[model samples]
Target: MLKIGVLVSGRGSNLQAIIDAIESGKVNASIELVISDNPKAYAIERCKKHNVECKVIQRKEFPSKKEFEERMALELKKKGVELVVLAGFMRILSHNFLKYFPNKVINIHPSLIPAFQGLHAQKQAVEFGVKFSGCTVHIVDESVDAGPVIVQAVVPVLPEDDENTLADRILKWEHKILPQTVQWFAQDRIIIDGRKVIVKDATYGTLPVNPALEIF
Candidate 1:
């Protein structure tokens, strides 16, 4: 089983889903530790509740993002973490950190990425008046959300929905695809090609094909 480390910054709703997956035996992996840059984050409570090792490595304590990531890498290495999951982690990792994780690190973005790249993605979708919004599960590259896409699940944006409402809708899809993508990783089903991703033996029935495209 792959030993996993989850990184979070705020409320760990995604982290919660991962924990649920592990508990239900849907994922053939173990969550070795939970790490957060924000010590006050509720994700820490999740670690406590699950009796998992939790650590807070503050950015202020490090000289640079690289330093912060180096320490984080050290911590994960200590726990024998084979994969790192960016559930709600707020910080961008350095290239060295990316090298350490390589194909082992994955992140779930709030949009179908390369679309809504950074923070306030739901709001960006609303501002741009897009009819569809979605979440992406991708390998963590040096770029911010500009990684090889693994799985994307789209949701229609209702006209009356605000950021919170739209975010809630997108999160539902996130829960579905994140678990599926992780299972694929555990099964060694993903292959990265140039800037694209290939899933071997995937159930195409669970995935959408050339649906509709919306950018915001």
Candidate 2:
């Protein structure tokens, strides 16, 4: 089985989704460790409930981002983690840290990426008056949410949608595709070629709808 480690900084709903997928035999991998950058993150509680090893290495305790990521990388290495999943990890990883896992790190972003990437993506979409905003599962790289896309699920932005409502809609798809991406990794079906990720036996078709069409 593929040994995996999850990094979280918040509620860890994505972590829970991956856990659920593993239990349902959708993801053929075992979670060796769940590390959180925040001590009060609810992700630790989820790990405890599932009997997975958990750790809290607060960023404030470290002198620099490098030191903090190094500590996280060390723990993942010690646990024999083969894959690193960023569930809700808020920290921006530097080039120094990526050297440890290389292309083995994955992340689930709240937006389609290459758009409204940095923070509050849902809010950014709403404020920008976007007609559709969804979630993206991508390989982790140095840029903020600029990773190569693995899978994406588009959701319509309702006329009455606010940040919270749009986020609620996008979050469901996030829960779905995040676990699916992890399963793909476990199956070794993902191949990276430059900025493109070719999923074997997958269909790459046209977009379901134009992203900017506003239905009023």
Candidate 3:
């Protein structure tokens, strides 16, 4: 089983999706811990309902940003986490923290990436009026949203859409791909060759031309 630890700083929509996937036996994984940066994040409430252990590591309580992140990383380590998933974690993890997990960290980001990155991506998409927008699950490097792409689910930007509507659609797609990507890792189906990553023998019957093939 993949021992997973999740980091979040917003509503647990994606986190909830992962929980549903595991609880439904659609994913071969276990959520060992969930760490949030904000005490008031709705994600914690979801954790309670799902019976997942969650802890808050507030930056204000720590002496420095590194201290804040170090404590968070150690909390995950205590659980023997095999993979770290950033659902909607807002903090930019430094090398200090990434060194502990190495290539074990992954994140879900809004937008097609290399296009609209960092803060308010939905707004970026609407302002640009792009016909096609999507979300990505990618490996987390020291840099922002620049990690190797793992999966993507393309969403259409409708003519009548604004940031809110577009965001709703993109978020729905995030819920889909994040859990699927995590499940793929649980099955040991992901391969990394230099900078290029591949998924091996995914036998799912849907999306034959496989969001799976669309972005996944």
Runs off by more than 4 Å, candidate 3? 203-216
lDDT of 2 by residue, 99-166 (tens): 99978899988887898898899999999988878988888988889988888778788878888999
For residue 215, model 3's alpha carbon misses the true position, in angstroms, by: 15
For candidate 3, the TM-score is 0.92
Clash totals for all candidate models? 0, 0, 3
Error of 3 at 11 (Å): 1.0
CA-lDDT, candidates in order:
0.82, 0.84, 0.85
- lDDT of predicted model 2: 0.84
- Top candidate on lDDT is 3
Q: Write model 3 residue lDDT over 1-216, tens digit each, in one string.
A: 999999999887899999998998888899999999899999999999989999988889988988888898899999999899998898889887889987779998888887898889999999999998889888898767888877776788889899899999889878878888888888888888775567887543443112254223
In candidate 3, the residue pairs with backbone N, CA or C atoms under 3 Å apart (3 or more residues apart, or in different chains) clash, namely 152-215, 207-210, 210-213
Candidate 2, run of 10 with poorest lDDT: 207-216
Question: Candidate order by lDDT, highest to lowest?
Answer: 3, 2, 1
Q: In candidate 1, what are the lDDT values of residues 23-93, reduced to their tens digit?
A: 88887888898999998999999889988789998999978777888999989999999889999999888
Residue 152 displacement (Å), model 2: 1.0
